[PDB]
Structure 1
Amino acid sequence: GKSGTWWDEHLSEENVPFIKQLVSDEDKAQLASKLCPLKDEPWPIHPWEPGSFRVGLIALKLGMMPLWTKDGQKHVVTLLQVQDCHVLKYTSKENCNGKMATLSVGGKTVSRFRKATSILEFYRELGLPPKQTVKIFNITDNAAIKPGTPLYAAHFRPGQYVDVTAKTIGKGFQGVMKRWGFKGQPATHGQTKTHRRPGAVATGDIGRVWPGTKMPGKMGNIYRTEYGLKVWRINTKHNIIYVNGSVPGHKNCLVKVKDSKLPAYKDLGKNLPFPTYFPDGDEEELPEDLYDENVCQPGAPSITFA
């Protein structure tokens, strides 16, 4: 029968680096070709509407750095770097669920040797290197964006609450006290094998247990959505987002940041680019860092109280 095989099996000692360099140059050229999407064949841009939404971005959680404001308080911001972010395809309204349109957005770039055949065919037909994960954002109809455009981290501006969701750090099969937070029996008070036992689970008259009973098992290996994350600083050169609070997940992982749907922040994106921030048609160069009117800039000459 057919045995297992990979890409560097039937290659000599002078062909593996050649193939690596060739595929590296190929993916670099493919990434550089999709740099100016506005000069090609862009879709018509529609004005901003109060009853519409937009597409989010995909970032990578670097680390967590402290941050101070002007009033003297100390906050905490999380670094979200956007390496490569593009649009895969576009699904119409009458093809998904008949409610809202969707957009396929991929994460960072990877290799073409550890992917499925259909994935490679799709990324070859589209013209972009394969990605790690694929996310879907629910948008409206007038926010239709042509697939194949670069998405930078400058799409968000300091002064907007966003929502970041990712896969949390899994704890595996753990006990119930560390999972659900149940109290435990005393220690050396004559206890005989019951320091971390839940005890009862149900009653004697029902003859069974309820499915909604908190019992030990796997916990942490799931995606959690975080709400109320205000941005305080937007970077342009390195494309770093400074979201306040914590991001559910570990370090060096792909997240999914988008606009918030809370009722307190309904129509607050009128001063924001509804389609996508294009560095070609803006006719202006944004600064390296975009600060807020409340965060203490590093170049401050020692703020003093009066």
Structure 2
Amino acid sequence: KSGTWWDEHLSEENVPFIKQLVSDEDKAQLASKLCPLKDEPWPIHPWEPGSFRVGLIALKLGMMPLWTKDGQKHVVTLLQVQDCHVLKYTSKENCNGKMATLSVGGKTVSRFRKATSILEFYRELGLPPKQTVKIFNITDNAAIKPGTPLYAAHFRPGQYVDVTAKTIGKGFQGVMKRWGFKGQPATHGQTKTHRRPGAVATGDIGRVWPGTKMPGKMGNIYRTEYGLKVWRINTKHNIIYVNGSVPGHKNCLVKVKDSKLPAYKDLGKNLPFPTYFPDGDEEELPEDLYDENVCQPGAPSITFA
């Protein structure tokens, strides 16, 4: 009848033992999935036109300036992919939709703060619980066996991706901050009217139209940015350098996938399909994958023609 937490009845000699025990198990579980191509992988099919592959979940680290051989400066958001895995696969018929779906998670968190149903679901999967889970629409040939890890090498430089995340919340806000209303003049007789919405509707209808711009909560909603290209990829730290800014605050989880813009369709011909497998790769990728236009930090200073 009383609530409880994991370390409520633990003595002083037991708390460190439990903390390291779960930590060791979590690391062991994560390291056991480092060879997906040897643990009976699902069949791999060649890329075909009209095929959609799975995406990624990353953490927003920050931004740095980036220059090109042309001489222009572009800002890039640091998206780091950590502990990203495929959880479960749902076929097209089961998911009663036009395309099959795939479940992906990332950013493993403590097991002591998860529901019983979620904990047992991860127990059979043999992976630590993830913070967020996203669903990606894929085709039949793009199926990936559950438990397969994913890395930032799944994308390549010169590829346009889409990022979706919850925006920075701002709480209850007025019309000026929320909808950019012009407000009222601050002087010349104005009485208690400097940020008021003013008229909300016409008098004849005798009501307020639904969807009217009114003061209320702002942010903490899911927004997606389209047409963002990848300038650089760091193989060692699994970091993607997406162009421009992305929604969400620092250290927030952002779902990444291939761009849906019509002008960017049929561009996954050379991209890894269904994903990149470092264990089964014949060669080792370089430390950093740059763009053709990106000037390397170690390259000599650019002299224009």
2:65 is aligned to 66
1:204 Cα deviation after fit: 1.1
SS of the residue corresponding to residue 142 of structure 1 reads: helix
For residues 259 and 218 of structure 1, what CA distance do their matches in structure 2 show?
31
Sequence identity percentage: 100
1:283 Cα deviation after fit: 1.3
1:98 Cα deviation after fit: 3.3
SS of the residue corresponding to residue 149 of structure 2 reads: coil
For residues 15 and 255 of structure 2, what CA distance do their matches in structure 1 show?
35
SS of the residue corresponding to residue 130 of structure 2 reads: coil
SS of the residue corresponding to residue 154 of structure 1 reads: helix
1:212 Cα deviation after fit: 2.0
For residues 90 and 147 of structure 1, what CA distance do their matches in structure 2 show?
7
1:118 Cα deviation after fit: 0.5
SS of the residue corresponding to residue 228 of structure 1 reads: strand
1:281 Cα deviation after fit: 1.4
1:195-230, CA deviations, whole angstroms, 9 ceiling, x for partnerless residues? 001111111111101012100101111010000100
Contact 2:163 2:255 in 1 (8 A): yes
1:48-75, CA deviations, whole angstroms, 9 ceiling, x for partnerless residues? 0011110000000000111111111111
2:191 is aligned to 192
1:193 Cα deviation after fit: 0.3
For residues 222 and 143 of structure 2, what CA distance do their matches in structure 1 show?
27
1:275 Cα deviation after fit: 1.1
1:268 is aligned to 267
Unaligned runs of 5+ in 1: none
1:161-191, CA deviations, whole angstroms, 9 ceiling, x for partnerless residues? 0001100001100001011001011112111
Contact 2:158 2:231 in 1 (8 A): yes
For residues 17 and 300 of structure 1, what CA distance do their matches in structure 2 show?
49
2:74 is aligned to 75
SS of the residue corresponding to residue 27 of structure 1 reads: helix
For residues 97 and 181 of structure 2, what CA distance do their matches in structure 1 show?
45
1:75-107, CA deviations, whole angstroms, 9 ceiling, x for partnerless residues? 110000011100111101111123101011012
For residues 112 and 197 of structure 1, what CA distance do their matches in structure 2 show?
48
Unaligned runs of 5+ in 2: none
SS of the residue corresponding to residue 107 of structure 1 reads: strand
1:305 Cα deviation after fit: 1.3
Contact 2:34 2:279 in 1 (8 A): no
For residues 203 and 292 of structure 1, what CA distance do their matches in structure 2 show?
56
More strand by share: 2
SS of the residue corresponding to residue 234 of structure 1 reads: strand
For residues 184 and 104 of structure 1, what CA distance do their matches in structure 2 show?
46
TM-score (norm 1): 0.99
Runs of 4+ in structure 1 off by over 6 angstroms are none
1:295 Cα deviation after fit: 0.9
SS of the residue corresponding to residue 19 of structure 2 reads: helix
- Give matches, 1:285-296, under 5 Å: 285-296=284-295
For residues 199 and 296 of structure 2, what CA distance do their matches in structure 1 show?
56
For residues 137 and 185 of structure 2, what CA distance do their matches in structure 1 show?
51
For residues 268 and 28 of structure 1, what CA distance do their matches in structure 2 show?
37
Contact 2:174 2:215 in 1 (8 A): yes
SS of the residue corresponding to residue 237 of structure 1 reads: coil
2:152 is aligned to 153
Aligned alpha-carbon RMSD (Å):
0.7
SS of the residue corresponding to residue 31 of structure 2 reads: helix
1:11 is aligned to 10
For residues 61 and 125 of structure 1, what CA distance do their matches in structure 2 show?
30
Contact 2:161 2:227 in 1 (8 A): yes
